[PDB]
């Protein structure tokens, strides 16, 4: 027979993993607890759209078919900004070459990644209570809470930052089976491109800039071809969050109150924002770390094993890799067993989840801890006193490093370590 | 405001590539002279990088090829043979590694593409006639042979080694326009495994072997799942091809290139059905293109560079051709989303200078390389038992050449294709 894959969770990675998964004669169901909804927006580095390419072209092709239209090509630029001083300078800059970036709305390229998809691939309504395993070969048994089960040779868990498969690798009571606060939470809204312009400038209005400042940071980009601007503004709480609801109502002046001694362009910014917003928590997996991504024939991915604070803005690029992966290793299992019993089929699952753990789990956690690290450098308290100022700035060798590991991972050499250790897995 | 592209040729090249262009977006028509499918039965293998090269251009082609073909996982080894003299003692052998070959049907790989492809995208029985290229800025009109016509962006010439393309390109009267002959010509049949055995060993009948010697070579896999093998003979042929490249031959007439060869090989021959086949080898090597492209029409496969066949992997050249020339297309489409007519067409032919640029010294490199190795399979020095150290390093030669075929860094010629396209656009 083939081989069948239950993917839990219908989010970016869970949905780009299945499109990798079919185009190659996998069998593949995704079980999403959402009803069919996309209830925001987000990028990806030009290593992950080579990623998403290798994955199934489509996916390339559905990114850039849900996003905009743009005489010269543009080169994409990380910009930051003093934004606690008037001075205002321009601190530091990132060139990521042409398309070095590419971005897309989250919910247009979800509806059409799932076009891509044969029908039937994705179950909606079918959230996940408890894992059944038993020996490596039997199937894997999937019980949703509507009463409902499935059957599949292997599982992953693509179900996010709250991962009911993490929990059940774990244990419901572990620390590692949940994320916790990063004290820090975001504000976020839009304003006109006019406002915008209005209290930044031109040039700063048109480009995607991170302000830098004690205690609490803010970026903006512009959206919706040009028209508006995205506001996040992220500050620090010293205080736990109550099962209060991550994301939740806000008012502009509670924002403003933040940034009161900053500079005045940004306050304005703050001021020409709806005077209703979100205060969105950050939650990750800093603290408690998976100690292995996989076990057996479950397999985690994406947010599930790895969720980050999101101040690199690549965490899905982390989980498009793992997505990559997790494909060609369960393609070499498919080929190198066709003919094999069910014994081998299902030691080779597992010679491949292990081979993933092996060479995802490092740069995965190094990426949760690095997106911490380079918020605290964006939110130094010396970029309150002037007179530590090369201090301050001395920061930012650092966050280039950071910001090249993540832009420039080698993804083939990935792959051929991760054929290898499936080979060596399996006595070979 | 979608890109159009008309592929001459409805082959294993002009399928694949059609199969990349179409899963990035691209509108295609495949415009393929035949009725049906030809090839039948026959056999084709593809390096392990020519398959990943395939992967890159939609992982469907893949699984296209494994549905159309305990103990540890098996390697795959070139091996050598000495045809000439009694001893028949193994020469060389060649280690290609876990999937370094993989093997398919091809008229069933070629169909199980199809079904890959979307409806209509593949049209019959259109055998191109004339191209009419107008200015850049429009379009390309193809003219076929039942009077229809179509209109497309540009052109792609994967219409094989009688490339009607190429004849446009360079004039239908025009030498580099026509393949010529090599000189060698072979015959093809099969035998069964049982009789295969009794005149090689089990061992040699099991896997495949070339047999070297003077001015002729032989070499010889199993097929139907080792039920029979397969045999081609090739030999040196002093005169012209007048006459049909392929014709019907005899079995005793094949023995006679085969006189003096040792007794396990003549058997072999020997073995063979009464009727047999015959082929002469065409190829660009003698009157080699002198570009790959020009405007909005660009030559793929063996309508650029067909070859002799003793490398055995000249489709894998090709599907090299249709990875860069997709990859370029699809840049050529986004990087021109929302610019003029004029940029467009303007940018189709940079990608097409760019295609030319990075592939077409490989592709020659490779024509020239597939004679070469066939020279070395047949040197005289194989009977001149004085000269059997000389003859023996030619190995070193044939190992190397190999890799350069096995070991090709496509990513690097990726990379240097989307260099070489901004340049030419002013980037
Ligand atoms: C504000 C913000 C901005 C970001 N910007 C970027 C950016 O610019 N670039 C970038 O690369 N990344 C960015 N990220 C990261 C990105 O959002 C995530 O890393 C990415 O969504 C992770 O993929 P996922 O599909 O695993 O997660 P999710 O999208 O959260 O997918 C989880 C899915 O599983 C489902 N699910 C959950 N529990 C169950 C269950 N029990 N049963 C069934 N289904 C279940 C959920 O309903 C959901 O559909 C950003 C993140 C945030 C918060
Ligand atoms: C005996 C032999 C064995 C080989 N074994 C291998 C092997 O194992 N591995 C490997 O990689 N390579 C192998 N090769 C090489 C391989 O067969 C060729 O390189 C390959 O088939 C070229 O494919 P193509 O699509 O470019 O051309 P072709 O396969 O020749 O197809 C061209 C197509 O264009 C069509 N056409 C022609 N003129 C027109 C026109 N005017 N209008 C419309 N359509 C037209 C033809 O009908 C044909 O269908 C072998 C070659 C030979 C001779
Ligand atoms: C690319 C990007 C997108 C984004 O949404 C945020 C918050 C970022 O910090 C970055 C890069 O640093
Ligand atoms: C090992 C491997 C397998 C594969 O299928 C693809 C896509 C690769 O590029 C690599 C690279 O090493
Ligand atoms: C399938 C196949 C094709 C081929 O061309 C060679 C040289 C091989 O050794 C194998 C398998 O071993
Ligand atoms: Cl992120
Ligand atoms: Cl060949």
Redesign the interface.
Known sequence: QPLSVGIVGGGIIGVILAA?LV???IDVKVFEQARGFREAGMAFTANAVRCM??????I??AL??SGA?????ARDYLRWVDGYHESSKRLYQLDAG??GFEACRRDQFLEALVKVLPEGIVECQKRLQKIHEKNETEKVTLEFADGTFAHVDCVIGADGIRSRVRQHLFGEDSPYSHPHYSHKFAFRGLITMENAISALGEDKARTLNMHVGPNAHLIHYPVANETMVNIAAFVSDPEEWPKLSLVGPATREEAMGYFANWNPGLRAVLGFMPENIDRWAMFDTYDYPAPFFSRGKICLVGDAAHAAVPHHGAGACIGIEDALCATVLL?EVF??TRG??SI?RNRAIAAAFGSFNAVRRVRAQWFVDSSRRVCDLYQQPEWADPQKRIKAENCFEEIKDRSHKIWHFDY?SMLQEAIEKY?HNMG?
């Open positions: 990798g185009r190659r004669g390419e290798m994955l199934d072209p489509a390339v092709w850039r078919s239209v743009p005489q010269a090509e042409i398309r393609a080929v190198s094999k019993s081998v083939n080979r070979s």
